[PDB]
Amino acid sequence: NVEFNDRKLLYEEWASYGVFYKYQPIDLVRKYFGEKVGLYFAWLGAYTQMLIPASIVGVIVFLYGCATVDENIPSMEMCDQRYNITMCPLCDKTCSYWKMSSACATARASHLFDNPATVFFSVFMALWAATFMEHWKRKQMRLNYRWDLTGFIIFMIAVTFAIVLGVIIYRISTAAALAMNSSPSVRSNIRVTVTATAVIINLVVIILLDEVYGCIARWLTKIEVPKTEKSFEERLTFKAFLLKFVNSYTPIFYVAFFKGRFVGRPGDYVYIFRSFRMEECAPGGCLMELCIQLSIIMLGKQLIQNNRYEVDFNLEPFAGLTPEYMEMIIQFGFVTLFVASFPLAPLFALLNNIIEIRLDAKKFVTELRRPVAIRAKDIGIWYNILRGVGKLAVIINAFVISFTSDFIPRLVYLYMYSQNGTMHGFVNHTLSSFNVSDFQNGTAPNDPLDLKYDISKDFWAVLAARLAFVIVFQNLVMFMSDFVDWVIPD
Amino acid sequence: NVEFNDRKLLYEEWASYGVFYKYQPIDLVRKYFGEKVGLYFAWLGAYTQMLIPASIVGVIVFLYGCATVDENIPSMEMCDQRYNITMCPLCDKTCSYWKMSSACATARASHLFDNPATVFFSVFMALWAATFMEHWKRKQMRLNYRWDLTGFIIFMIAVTFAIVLGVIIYRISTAAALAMNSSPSVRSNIRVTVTATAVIINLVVIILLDEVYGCIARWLTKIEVPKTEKSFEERLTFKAFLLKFVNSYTPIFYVAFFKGRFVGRPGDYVYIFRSFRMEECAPGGCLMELCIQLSIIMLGKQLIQNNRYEVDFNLEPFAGLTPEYMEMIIQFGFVTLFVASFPLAPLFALLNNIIEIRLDAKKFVTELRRPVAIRAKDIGIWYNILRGVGKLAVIINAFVISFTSDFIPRLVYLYMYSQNGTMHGFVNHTLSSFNVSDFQNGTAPNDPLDLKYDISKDFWAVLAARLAFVIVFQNLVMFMSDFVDWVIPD
Ligand SMILES: [Ca+2]
Ligand SMILES: [Ca+2]
């Protein structure tokens, strides 16, 4: 049945348009391919199945996004008429009412969600990622338990990270490449497609630069000479992962945190409100949620949109499972580390990962022609990374969520002194922009009102609650995950 | 050798004045007493031995405290002449210069340390406690590994915690009991001994109330009826521990955090500076470090200062090892959870624990007359608590250390604009008290200078860095402990 070993893995692992729609034969992969090869699919099967509860709620958070802001309209009106104000000292009879309508359309996607919708799903997903950490740990105690029964100097690396983390203008060059590849100055779909193009300019060159680090890490680990060939690869991954970590996520880390930070431009209100790209592209909306919304979409989708044994010598060799491990944990850190801005990040992984099983199943049958049946153990070298990413999960998204949806639910608690918490708690969408542009550019300029001097002290009050949210978050969610670590495996 | 079983544990475990000075025969305890009984002494042996590196540095932090503030005198002068100012609107020819000299003596102990001495040892000890968590884990993998080879409704509880955490005026009554048991109004040694007395009034009654919770927890767990008698005791500890946790540490949790918080008294500078206990006891120094210094001393020391078998029926029974487990983890949480104010908390545990081996060794030979040789396994039901206390360690002392020694190393970075970071960085001891009384009573009253309104916004700036220190702390020290969790057991 060596032919039927191919055929049952040809036919039942054929489809590559969508689901197989028969079953998911993870056992058949372990019947043939091997416990190294099978525990990649067993994980990616379990990862696909556990994205289904996550993706449905991402639709419900879309539905609680879409319906509860179209029906009662509490955060379109307050959010379109926020951005109707954000250019009122830009007008002065020169290019008056342009980017507001662009800004009023960004707020339909961004400010659809902020305070209930982003936050409740993130606390869910960080618990879910810890649950998925726990459920896979029980699945390790069910699949590897089933598998164990069937078995019967280093400153050069820190130099290269300063190189690789110094490779950020390379993103800004690609952010400038699409600024001249098409160069439109419009508001309907210009900024949507130009930032779509630059991510595509990134993903082409980053994958070219992803192959650079492999030739960097292989010669560098051969220079260090570890004696054991097992820990040689273990040093090789942790070298090359951290290279590919800081290759792949540093565009996002730039645009989540550092692209918005570190900038305060002088010339108060008359010159603060205008001077971004000469008043035409986007001082209507800075809104860095969308640049994280648009990037992870193209980062999630275009893994697809780019891609008797005498003939077996004519083809590329096997053992590409350590990039394959890596290729999905780059996507696991897209889901879990960054689910605050857009919550359908499971489904853009889910629609992806349905093909990505069958894309990689077909890549292991009709390509990469040596199914060795290696059957080694211990995927845990990435599970150590995954928990560490999961430890970074409750840190990083708490540093994502507590800089976007904590402007407003404390500005409930300044201007609503008399009457409300929620109902006229939507009135403090706008006046936070009348305060100004809520970042470091925006809590500073009320000194021409009162006579950066004193009003940049209300910046600290949010920055208190910014830091107070995280210290509540990574303590509760590490305590909520202290529940889930004990409930499941017994 | 049944007599010699007694005699070798009589004679080699006799001394009870200090060290045995022969050896520490942990094996002989496991040769006779049992792996339940022995792994208490094996832990308390390892806990005593690992306090020796901690206690020496506590002397060095005392030496870096004592010498570097007596020789160069940079934080006596700046700290005595801080407190020479803190009553200058109290004087007004009525009880002028009294409590300054009391305050100038509190600052010799408190402000001996703050910014280098407390902080460097805490980061050391929180790493050390994680190291001691790791070293005992390797000792578990060496002692229990040696031992495993030789082996061949619940709302009623949450009601009672609201009772027990509601039992805090009981501390304040004992804080008022010593206020009338002697009632002096002096400054040399009145506040030192009155607060020494009230802790003694606590430790008498708390131990009386510690026995109350056992009769509470035993009937309450018998009311819940767990079927398995093993998990019956496991529910019993976690009921009674959390009772004795909130019995014992809630005086400290009160005086660390909540006794200083939640109080802002109106009537600015003329009435703010004076109105604590009518200007005679201690508006010279509030200084809640000492109340945590003095309490843990009496909490650490006075475990001592209060305390052919026909005759065996005339004595109290065995199986008091679950309070004995508890009695030391109350002391482990004295060391690790609270080492920021006074750093010799290892040595006041160390001098204690040298006797506390021989006190409890003699209590198991000449008293409690049944050494059953039970030899059961798994101390880990408290190791789960201990890591949880150790997880609370990096939280709580970061909430201890970042409210005392973060007044000043950011007030380096207000008034030293021109010339210094450290040398005239001692000049901002005083002006923080000229700001006022650095807590919530103290960042508020500059509104009669400028015309609570606006100057309570520099409170947030510290409260930023208060929260910013913790979020640096419990992330770095959980990353520094990510090193130590991998270095030792391989
Ligand atoms: Ca793939
Ligand atoms: Ca004892």
UniProtKB/Swiss-Prot annotation, chains A, B:
Result when mutating F338A: Increased permeability to chloride ions
Effect on the protein of changing R277E: Reduced anion permeability and increased cation permeability
Domain of life, per lineage: Eukaryota
N-terminal signal peptide: none
UniProt topological domain (Extracellular) ranges: 64-115, 171-198, 259-287, 402-468
Site positions per UniProt: Unlikely to bind calcium but may play an important structural role: K137
Result, substituting S295A: Decreased permeability to chloride ions
One GO BP: establishment of localization in cell
Phenotype for D485 to A/K: Increased Ca(2+) sensitivity
Subcellular location: Apical cell membrane; Presynapse
Tissue localization of expression: Expressed at the apical surface of the vomeronasal epithelium (at protein level). Expressed in the lateral and septal nasal glands (at protein level). Highly expressed in pulmonary bronchiole epithelial cells, pancreatic and submandibular gland acinar cells, kidney proximal tubule, all retinal cell layers, most sensory cells of dorsal root ganglia, Leydig cells and spermatocytes (at protein level). In the dorsal root ganglia, detected in small-diameter nociceptive neurons and in larger myelinated neurons (at protein level).
Disulfide topology: C79-C104, C91-C95, C281-C286
Topology feature Cytoplasmic, residues: 220-237, 364-380
Annotated Ca(2+) 2 binding sites: E324, D360
Reactions performed catalytically: chloride(in) = chloride(out)
Reported phenotype of the disruption mutant: Mice display severe tracheomalacia with gaps in the tracheal cartilage rings along the entire length of the trachea. 90% of mutants die within the first nine days of postnatal life and no mutants survive longer than 30 days postpartum. Embryonic radial glial cells exhibit significantly shorter processes and mutant embryos display abnormal cortical organization and decreased cortical thickness. Conditional knockout in mature vomeronasal sensory neurons abolishes calcium-activated chloride currents but does not affect Tmem16b expression or glomerular development in the accessory olfactory bulb.
Note: The term 'anoctamin' was coined because these channels are anion selective and are predicted to have eight (OCT) transmembrane segments. There is some dissatisfaction in the field with the Ano nomenclature because it is not certain that all the members of this family are anion channels or have the 8-transmembrane topology.
Similarity comment text for this entry: Belongs to the anoctamin family.
Subunit field text: Homodimer. Interacts with CFTR. Interacts with TRPV4.
Protein name in UniProt: Anoctamin-1
Originating species: Mus musculus (Mouse)
Gene from which the chain derives: Ano1
